[PDB]
Amino acid sequence: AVTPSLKNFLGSLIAGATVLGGIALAITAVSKFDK
Amino acid sequence: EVNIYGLTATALFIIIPTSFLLILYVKTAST
Amino acid sequence: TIAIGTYQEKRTWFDDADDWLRQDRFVFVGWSGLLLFPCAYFALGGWLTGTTFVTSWYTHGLATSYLEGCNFLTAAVSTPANSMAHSLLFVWGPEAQGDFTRWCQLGGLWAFVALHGAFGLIGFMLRQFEIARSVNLRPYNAIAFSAPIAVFVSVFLIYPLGQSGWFFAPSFGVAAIFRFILFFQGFHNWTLNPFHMMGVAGVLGAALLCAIHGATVENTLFEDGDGANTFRAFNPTQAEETYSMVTANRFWSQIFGVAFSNKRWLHFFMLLVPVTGLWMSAIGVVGLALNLRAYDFVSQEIRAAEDPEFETFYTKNILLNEGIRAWMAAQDQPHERLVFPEEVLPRGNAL
Amino acid sequence: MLTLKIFVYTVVTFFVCLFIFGFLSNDPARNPGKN
Amino acid sequence: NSDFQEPGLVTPLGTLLRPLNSEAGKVLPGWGTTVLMAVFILLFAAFLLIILEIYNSSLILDDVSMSWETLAK
Amino acid sequence: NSSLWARFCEWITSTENRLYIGWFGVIMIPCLLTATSVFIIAFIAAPPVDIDGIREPVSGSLLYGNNIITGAVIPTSNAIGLHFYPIWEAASLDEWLYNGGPYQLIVCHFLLGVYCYMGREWELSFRLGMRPWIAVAYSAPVAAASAVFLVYPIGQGSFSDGMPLGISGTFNFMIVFQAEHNILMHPFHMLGVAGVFGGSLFSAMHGSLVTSSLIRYNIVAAHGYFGRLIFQYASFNNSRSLHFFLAAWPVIGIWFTALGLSTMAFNLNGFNFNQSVVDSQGRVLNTWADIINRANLGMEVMHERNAHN
Amino acid sequence: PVERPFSDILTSIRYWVIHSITVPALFIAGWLFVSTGLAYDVFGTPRPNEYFTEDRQEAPLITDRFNALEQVKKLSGN
Amino acid sequence: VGDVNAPIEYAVGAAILVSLVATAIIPIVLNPGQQAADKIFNAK
Amino acid sequence: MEALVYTFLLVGTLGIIFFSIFFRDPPRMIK
Amino acid sequence: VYPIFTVRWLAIHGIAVPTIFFLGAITAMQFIQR
Amino acid sequence: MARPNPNKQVVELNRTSLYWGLLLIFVLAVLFSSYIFN
């Protein structure tokens, strides 16, 4: 069964993926604007 | 003769590096 | 055959990202910046927030915050309680369950700061490597920093990992660090361990070298300026050195007995001393983490126990350690629920 | 031990007199500079 | 030097194993297959995190008991 | 020029000797030689000494069951207090040993030797054309040693409070301060710790940059690295100011810590934050200072004998 | 594209117009944050009169890992 | 209990004094650094 | 036995110090 | 010279805003009767 | 027994290095002998 701790862990995985994607998008957009 | 192993350890640690360094110095000084 | 050189292909997103990151601005971001800046920023922010608002009432039974009326020397970010043995104390973890107030109360802020700070140190080392590669210099600053990172890793992660839990790691503060130092002096006899002796020698020798080199260089300058002050008689584009090596060499060969005759060797010795000292100290604390302490000198203990009329400073140090332990464990370790009656507390009156 | 006292006093006086008569024998003018 | 100072010794095993040590320095154009490596690295990191949390009691699973008592299965 | 005095002056003042002597040399040489001779002899084969003056001798010589770490030369007895106790003042050599005269002998001769070494540094610097400001740098360790070995006993009133010449003696010395005066919280000791740590940091980093720059540029190349590493552009762009800063930081730190120890000799104290936080109704909430104070209280209680037979 | 010198902004008018009305807002926000009592609620720091609960007259102790939330809620009296 | 004794009048009075003393000296400390960084940059 | 070992080690250290002071190779590299 | 919202702007503001907030908080804490 | 190896240098150790090594070993022995003997 999906224990609450496992649900929280999957949520943390999603949040980390979101943070990394945000950083990547920021660098990409800024580089494209400047070049 | 107390802690014979300790005495042997001290003697080896004082002799082996000293002999190695002295042999190296004599070998190189010939150049 | 189809040979190839370097960068003879079409440009890619990676090329644009690299070009933007490695620009010339007031702040050098670089690739290591992505890992360094966020982590260090959050570490500093967490420390300040913990020292300003959060308290340690429910972990150590103390009051450590400006909101509670503590000075800059007594405020600190206390470690989590001993019940939380080695949990990483995530906000979403089984302990906090997602409540920020309870997360702060239990003491996960310490783990937050410690982890993000360790990753910040890694990022800083990578930044030094990146700068050195960019400007084409050998990376010796990398090793010079590899020393303190090793010391930090040892003290703040390996020592608690061998003990009961995070409760015994340093708390980020001044009075907390003093408590830590006294705690080792009492329980481990950390002052008698050879590794701390070597570290002390290394640090003191580093200070000595700094002072002596500065004094010698500043007291052997060449006459290349009419003004009374020698600071303005120099520009960064000088060709020759600003001080006479021969005169300093003769002076220190006639005063002390042995003197340097090679700039590279001198500055490399400067680099070498402190790094070795701190590495040896780190190894010593690594050993202590497993309660592998140099405490006994069993022969002296046996001789002292045999007859009371034989006292050396070592026995007095042992007695002082006993006193420290007995009198401080009462409130230093609340989870043990220790209540020593005044009859049993060690005292010099009873020897 | 009076003899030891006498010997120590004599030695100390000799050395101190040597030092004093040393620094008084035109110290400042014996330097590598010329002025 | 000529052919790096004349040819070396020849042995049957050397001749047999020569093919495995011939194409030195060959490379593919572009980035090749770095994206697959990145995906695999991410999956490995996730697996390492999962095991680390399982062994640290930060991720309690129904089946695992996480104690010496599991030896009495 | 050919007078015996002239020949002696030329020999003492000559710079062709392997080790320069000078007049400060003629003073310091016998002092330091006597100090080291007596120190070695007492460290090897000295008998017990009653430091506390309660007929409880403390053994510190190697022959009496001791190592390098646990050996030392015990300071003089508490009965002598601050009196002057030369060898010819004691009734007999055995009593002189029992009371602890060689500590006084060593400390006096060594202090004179270090002061004359300070003087000889300037003397040789002047004989060569160098500038005379190395003695100022050397004053820091000399000041600290003079404080610890002479000023603290004067303030406390006895030489038994001096630092025993050993390792475990030094550790006991430090522990007794932390018990009595709370040195750790004194601002001057904080400045001393900062000076030592900053000196180590600057030595390591200066060595690293200089070694990296030196290629088969010394300051104009590494400055580009430093300005962008931790920001802080155009801070130490002059090669002379940098070395002056190096020479200045640790010396000032050690001066401040020595002055702090001297002030503690007259017993003001370190800081004291005991019971500085109280809630309503008057109850007391513990802070880290209270734990430090508990450790200090246990230390002090252990040290004092009180009941001495 | 040259990272205008700080001197240029120092003499600007819009810079001062913005900052002289913005910074005081932050300062007053902090003052009201720690004055209204929001800090105690947000960060869980007990008030001076909440240290010792009616039924408890000593420092608290968690002595529990997987039920630390309920333990802390009970000890704090909330 | 744990309320602030002082009123908001002093809050604003001190805000004015500690807000216009920090927004005008943060660019004066960095000016040397920004002036020297450009000299270091675009050179090597 | 321990005392003799300690004395020998200290004497050896002092002897190496003296030899370094008095029998060093001349520093002709830069002088 | 013209564009704003650069790296320097973000870097300075990030450490500037919380500093002012915390200074206000501490100044307010000063005037508590305990 | 096949061909002399071109990569063959010889180690060199000046006197200062020898003094440093002797000092290091003797100092370490001084520091550690008491602990070894207990």
Ligand code: CLA
């Ligand atoms: C580069 C910057 C950086 C770095 C290195 C870290 C690192 C860390 N943070 Mg910090 N953090 C950051 C930025 C950063 N953070 C930012 C920007 C914020 C604000 C949003 C935070 C807010 C924050 C909080 C509030 C907390 C942390 C915590 C942590 C620690 C736990 C890491 C973890 O499990 O997270 C998750 C990490 C990952 C998910 C790794 C990435 C792996 C990806 C997702 C793989 C995906 C592949 C695939 C889809 C997965 C398949 C499996 C499944 C889905 C089927 C760690 C030391 C926690 C901690 O330890 O505090 C005590 C904590 O409580 N951080």
Ligand code: CLA
């Ligand atoms: C003469 C007295 C003396 C001296 C010189 C030393 C010397 C030393 N001791 Mg000490 N010690 C002594 C007596 C002494 N000891 C006594 C009598 C005791 C009682 C037992 C102790 C107890 C003791 C303990 C318990 C410990 C030491 C440690 C050390 C070492 C410190 C290494 C270091 O700098 O780490 C400090 C540096 C770091 C941790 C690096 C962190 C740097 C980060 C990355 C910077 C962060 C950025 C920051 C926010 C920027 C702000 C800058 C701002 C401050 C300006 C060093 C060899 C420590 C050690 O090295 O053990 C391994 C240690 O744990 N000693």
Ligand code: CLA
């Ligand atoms: C991180 C931990 C730490 C650190 C880094 C320090 C650092 C320091 N402490 Mg503190 N201390 C600590 C923890 C710490 N302490 C704790 C926990 C305690 C309580 C247990 C103390 C208690 C304490 C006391 C009580 C004292 C210190 C002192 C000092 C200083 C010692 C170095 C000095 O000034 O000597 C300077 C150099 C000398 C004293 C040596 C002089 C050398 C002479 C002049 C020449 C000798 C010639 C030699 C014999 C011949 C050699 C020739 C050849 C063989 C090489 C330094 C600032 C001392 C201090 O401040 O000094 C005033 C002091 O008195 N500390």
Ligand SMILES: C=Cc1c(C)c2cc3nc(c4c5[nH]c(cc6nc(cc1[nH]2)C(C)=C6CC)c(C)c5C(=O)[C@@H]4C(=O)OC)[C@@H](CCC(=O)OC/C=C(\C)CCC[C@H](C)CCC[C@H](C)CCCC(C)C)[C@@H]3C
């Ligand atoms: C008291 C000890 C001590 C401190 C505080 C210190 C501090 C520093 N040294 C640095 C550098 C160095 N240190 C070096 C050698 C040494 N440094 C030493 C000892 C120290 N060095 C010693 C003994 C050596 C000899 C080996 C070198 C060789 C370098 C450098 O190259 C570098 C430099 O250029 O400096 C000029 C800087 C690294 C910046 C940084 O953190 O990156 C950013 C990373 C951050 C901010 C993450 C850290 C987060 C920390 C771990 C969390 C806790 C933060 C709280 C504020 C803790 C407060 C604790 C309370 C008790 C106050 C920083 C100014």
Ligand SMILES: CC(C)=CCC/C(C)=C/CC/C(C)=C/CC/C(C)=C/CC/C(C)=C/CC/C(C)=C/CC/C(C)=C/CC/C(C)=C/CC/C(C)=C/CC1=CC(=O)C(C)=C(C)C1=O
């Ligand atoms: C009976 C008796 C004898 C009693 C003795 C009892 C007893 C206690 C014995 C002592 C025991 C003992 C030896 C203890 C110490 C043991 C110990 C802790 C060892 C640590 C060893 C160790 C490996 C530590 C690791 C760190 C380490 C390598 C430290 C090195 C320390 C060190 C040598 C520092 C340098 C010291 C020093 C004085 C340097 C000065 C250099 C110098 C002359 C530069 C001058 C100079 C400046 C210029 O600017 C220029 C230009 C020139 C040209 C120039 O020259």
Ligand SMILES: CCCCCCCCCCCCCCCC(=O)OC[C@H](COP(=O)(O)OC[C@@H](O)CO)OC(=O)CCCCCCCCCCCCCCC
């Ligand atoms: C996508 C996230 C966007 C930002 C969110 C706000 C960030 C600021 C958070 C401040 C603290 C407030 C409390 C939040 C905490 C909180 O409220 O969590 C709550 C949330 C859900 O828990 P529940 O409240 O549903 O649980 C209740 C019960 O069911 C528990 O048994 O937990 C998660 O799913 C993970 C959330 C992560 C949020 C942190 C984001 C960062 C993740 C780590 C990133 C690492 C990057 C590594 C790169 C290599």
Ligand SMILES: CCCCCCCCCCCCCCCC(=O)OC[C@H](COP(=O)(O)OC[C@@H](O)CO)OC(=O)CCCCCCCCCCCCCCC
């Ligand atoms: C009146 C004053 C009398 C002072 C007497 C004491 C002088 C001490 C002489 C130290 C010699 C150390 C060996 C150097 C061996 C040697 O030949 O070094 C020579 C070396 C200079 O070498 P070069 O610059 O020529 O080398 C260039 C390189 O590229 C290699 O060629 O000197 C130094 O680097 C500084 C040495 C300071 C090191 C100080 C160490 C102090 C240790 C003290 C141990 C005491 C133990 C006590 C036990 C009870």
Ligand SMILES: CCCCCCCCCCCCCCCC(=O)OC[C@H](COP(=O)(O)OC[C@@H](O)CO)OC(=O)CCCCCCCCCCCCCCC
């Ligand atoms: C089982 C078989 C046996 C195993 C053991 C074998 C051991 C072999 C020997 C290993 C050690 C060799 C050491 C060589 C020593 C040596 O000759 O070094 C010389 C070397 C510098 O060499 P250079 O770069 O000048 O070389 C230039 C070339 O021309 C060759 O000289 O210094 C170092 O790299 C660090 C040396 C150790 C650190 C020295 C300073 C710090 C320690 C001294 C502390 C004194 C006490 C101070 C506190 C009181």
Ligand SMILES: CC1=C(/C=C/C(C)=C/C=C/C(C)=C/C=C/C=C(C)/C=C/C=C(C)/C=C/C2=C(C)CCCC2(C)C)C(C)(C)CCC1
């Ligand atoms: C919440 C949190 C977070 C974050 C945080 C942060 C990011 C923070 C920051 C913070 C900060 C960023 C802070 C700052 C602060 C500052 C301060 C607090 C300052 C102070 C200062 C002072 C106190 C000064 C003084 C002085 C001077 C210098 C001038 C005059 C003189 C005197 C000495 C008076 C997160 C979400 C991630 C997670 C969870 C937790």
Ligand SMILES: CC1=C(C)C(=O)C(CC[C@](C)(O)CCC[C@H](C)CCC[C@H](C)CCCC(C)C)=C(C)C1=O
């Ligand atoms: C020419 C030009 C320059 C010089 C410039 O700085 C910008 C702003 C980009 C950005 C907002 O800084 C993007 C910052 C986002 C960054 C990628 C996030 C990850 C890295 C760090 C967290 C950034 C903060 C570092 C700072 C604290 C030193 C633009 C748009 C331009 O056109």
Ligand SMILES: [Fe+2]
């Ligand atoms: Fe230098």
